[PDB]
UniProtKB/Swiss-Prot annotation:
Keyword Kinase attached: no
Identification of the protein by name: Photosystem II extrinsic protein O
Record's keyword terms, sorted: Manganese, Membrane, Photosynthesis, Photosystem II, Signal, Thylakoid
Entry's transmembrane regions: none
Residues of the full protein shown: 45 to 272 of 272
Gene Ontology MF annotations: oxygen evolving activity
Gene for this chain: psbO
Source domain of life: Bacteria
Family statement: Belongs to the PsbO family.
Protein source organism: Synechococcus elongatus
Function per UniProt: One of the extrinsic, lumenal subunits of photosystem II (PSII), which stabilize and protect the oxygen-evolving complex. PSII is a light-driven water plastoquinone oxidoreductase, using light energy to abstract electrons from H(2)O, generating a proton gradient subsequently used for ATP formation. Required for dimerization of PSII and for binding of PsbQ to PSII.
Topological category with respect to the lipid bilayer: Peripheral membrane protein
Amino acid sequence: CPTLDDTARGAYPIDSSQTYRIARLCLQPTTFLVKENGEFVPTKLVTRETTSLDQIQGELKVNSDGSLTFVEEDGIDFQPVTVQMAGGERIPLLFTVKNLVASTQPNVTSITTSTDFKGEFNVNGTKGQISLNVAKVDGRTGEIAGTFESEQLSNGHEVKIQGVFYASIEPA
Ligand SMILES: [Ca+2]
Ligand SMILES: [Ca+2]
Ligand SMILES: [Ca+2]
């Protein structure tokens, strides 16, 4: 995924008289865990081409409590991946955030390094959950970066996926 400038600093103010969007969201997985014996255990990513989701975008709606809700409306939000268990089994997994709806804490006055987005998405007839932890904000450009963790059910396996993300926020 893209990265922020070395000098990225400061919060990104949100003007309540304006509306905003996520123009781009990129998820780069660093971690695929598969449940075995009730434990999420690590696997090796075997797919050597791009495994990121990117170009994800959509409105940021304002709720009555001042939180923002991201409604995913487009993007490369689905990627088939193959991982390999320690014992050698190669499992195809579906990495996705399709139909993501994720909200911040209340009373949004600015996007900061303590902003979180939490919500749910659809994986071919079941729900997944995801948390985005913003870790860095460029207040000048609207670029943000952080880490994510999702849980879902792809191909008869309960799967956790973790990694890094980049996004850009801008007025509508
Ligand atoms: Ca453990
Ligand atoms: Ca453990
Ligand atoms: Ca944070």
